[PDB]
Ligand binder design. Structure first.
Ligand SMILES: C=C(C)CCOP(=O)(O)OP(=O)(O)O
Ligand SMILES: C=C(C)CCOP(=O)(O)OP(=O)(O)O
Lengths: 248, 260
C-alpha cells in the first residue's frame, strides 16, 4: 500500500558543488520510479508513494551562511534574511526534482515544511493534507527545509526526521533509504540486517547513527541501499532487498 | 497588535496578461511597507504583519485549463498534472513578491497552503508555524493556492478565504484591503465609516441596482470584519502612500469598525 522512498541528498546533487544537479542520475531515478509505479498498475495493485529528498547542494551551502559557532554550538543569525534564502534554495531544488518526476508522468506535488512544520520539543507537522493527497494517488515530494523551533528558534529538519515521523504517523508498509553506499557499512561491509540482537554492538561501532536510531524509536523497518546502481530503486520499490535491513 | 494586509484587486498583476507583473507598483508597495515598519520601530510600537496575495496572472490562467463545468458545477480534472502546475505558477509569483519585499529588507517568508491546508466546510489550516514566525518578527507571506478538499476533490483557496480565517485564528486587530478602488463606493464615492449603526443600511445598498459593486465583494469583506469584532480599511492600493498610511491606520478610504 504505502511506501516512502528517501532520495539521499547525494545521488541527486553533489554536495561539494554548490547548486549542482546530477541530471542523468536524477532522470534515471525518475524513470525507475515510473517503471515501478507502472509495474503496480499492471498487477492492478494500488500503491501509495511519498518521496523525500535532502538539501543536496542547495540547502546546505546556503544554510551555512547563517550558522556560526557560538561555543561549539550551531547558531542561526540574520534569519530576517536567512529564513527566506534557505526557503528559496530549497524551492529551486524542490522544483527541479518535481518537474523531472512530472516529465515521467509521475504525479508529484510539493510539500514545503518551512510553511507549517514546527520542530518543537514535540514535533509539529499536520499530515492531513498529505493523507488526502494520497487518497488521490498524488505523490507528495517532501524536502529537508528550514523550520521554526519554538525552543531554539530555528532548526534544519532533515529527511531522516521527516521519513520516520511519516512512516509512523501514516503507518507506512515499506521504508526506503536510497543513497551512495550499498547499505550500512561495518568495517566496510554492508550488514545483511539489523535487529534487537546485533544492534547493541553497532551503536557502539558508530545510513548513519541518527537514522538507525530514530527509525527503531518508531519500531520501523526500512532498507538502506545504493541509489547509484542502475535498477536498485526500481527493485527496492517492488519489495526486493539489495542493502541493509533495519527491523524494529 | 496584529495587522493583515491583503494585496488584492489587480494591483500586483494584470490577470489579462499571462504572467503579468506590475513591477513598478509592487516595488512601491514594498517601499511603503518598509516605510511603515521603520516607522513603527521609531515610535517603539510592536507590530506583527501578515501579507496575503492572490493568483493574479499566475493562478487562474493556469487553473482554468484544469476546470470544467459538469452538471452545472465546477470540477477539477487531470489534477495529476494540474495540482503541481498551479503550485508551480503560485510558487513563482510568491518568489517574485518575497524577493522584492526582501530587496527592501522586509523580513518576508513564504507560506504555501497547498502543502498542508485541507479545504473542508471548516478549513484545516494549522497556523502554529505562522505564530512562531510573527513571534520572531518575520513577515509571513501567504498566497491563494490550490488545495485538496475532504470530498474527493480540489478547491482554490483565495485571499478571501485566508484573511478571514487568519483574522479569527490569530485574532487580528487590523485588516487592510488594498484594492483597485477608493473604498466601498456608495454613489461613486467611498463611505467614510461603516459601523454597527449603518452596516445593514450599507449591505442593503450594496445589494441594490445603484451600487457600483455587484460582485458581492465588498459585502463579504464588511461582514468578516464585524464577524471578527475588529477594524479594517478598504482603500486604493494603487495610490502612492495609501498603503503606508493604511498600515499606520490613517489611510483615507472606507473604515469598518466592529472592534471592542
Ligand atoms: C538542510 C536542509 C534544509 C535539508 C535537510 O538536509 P538533508 O536531510 O538533505 O541532509 P542532512 O544534513 O539533514 O543530513
Ligand atoms: C491559485 C489561485 C487561483 C489563487 C487565487 O486566489 P485569490 O485570492 O485570487 O481568490 P480569487 O480571486 O480567484 O477568488
Amino acid at each position: 500500500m504505502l511506501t516512502i522512498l528517501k532520495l539521499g541528498g547525494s545521488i541527486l546533487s553533489d554536495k561539494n558543488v554548490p547548486y549542482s544537479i546530477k541530471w542523468d542520475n536524477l532522470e534515471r531515478i525518475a524513470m525507475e520510479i515510473k517503471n515501478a509505479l507502472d509495474y503496480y498498475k499492471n498487477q492492478n495493485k494500488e500503491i501509495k508513494l511519498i518521496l523525500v529528498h535532502g538539501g543536496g547542494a542547495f540547502g546546505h551551502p546556503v544554510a551555512k551562511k547563517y550558522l556560526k559557532i557560538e561555543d561549539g554550538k550551531k547558531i542561526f543569525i540574520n534569519m530576517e534574511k536567512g529564513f527566506w534564502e534557505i526557503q528559496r534554495a530549497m524551492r529551486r531544488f524542490n522544483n527541479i526534482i518535481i518537474d523531472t518526476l512530472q516529465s515521467y508522468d509521475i504525479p508529484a506535488v510539493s510539500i514545503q515544511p518551512s510553511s507549517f512544520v514546527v520542530f518543537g520539543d514535540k514535533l509539529i507537522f499536520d499530515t492531513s493534507a498529505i493523507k488526502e493527497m494520497l487518497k488521490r494517488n498524488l505523490v507528495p515530494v517532501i524536502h529537508g527545509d528550514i523550520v521554526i523551533d519554538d525552543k531554539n528558534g530555528y532548526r534544519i529538519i532533515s529527511g531522516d526526521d521527516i521519513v520516520p515521523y511519516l512512516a509512523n504517523e501514516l503507518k507506512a508498509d515499506l521504508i526506503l533509504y536510497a543513497t551512495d553506499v550499498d547499505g550500512v557499512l561495518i568495517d566496510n561491509k554492508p550488514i545483511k540486517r539489523i535487529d534487537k540482537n546485533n544492534i547493541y554492538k553497532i551503536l557502539n561501532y558508530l545510513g548513519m547513527k541518527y537514522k538507525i536510531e530514530m527509525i527503531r524509536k518508531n519500531k520501523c523497518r526500512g532498507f538502506v541501499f545504493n541509489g547509484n546502481k542502475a535498477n536498485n530503486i526500481y527493485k527496492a520499490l517492488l519489495g526486493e532487498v539489495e542493502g541493509t535491513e533495519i527491523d524494529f
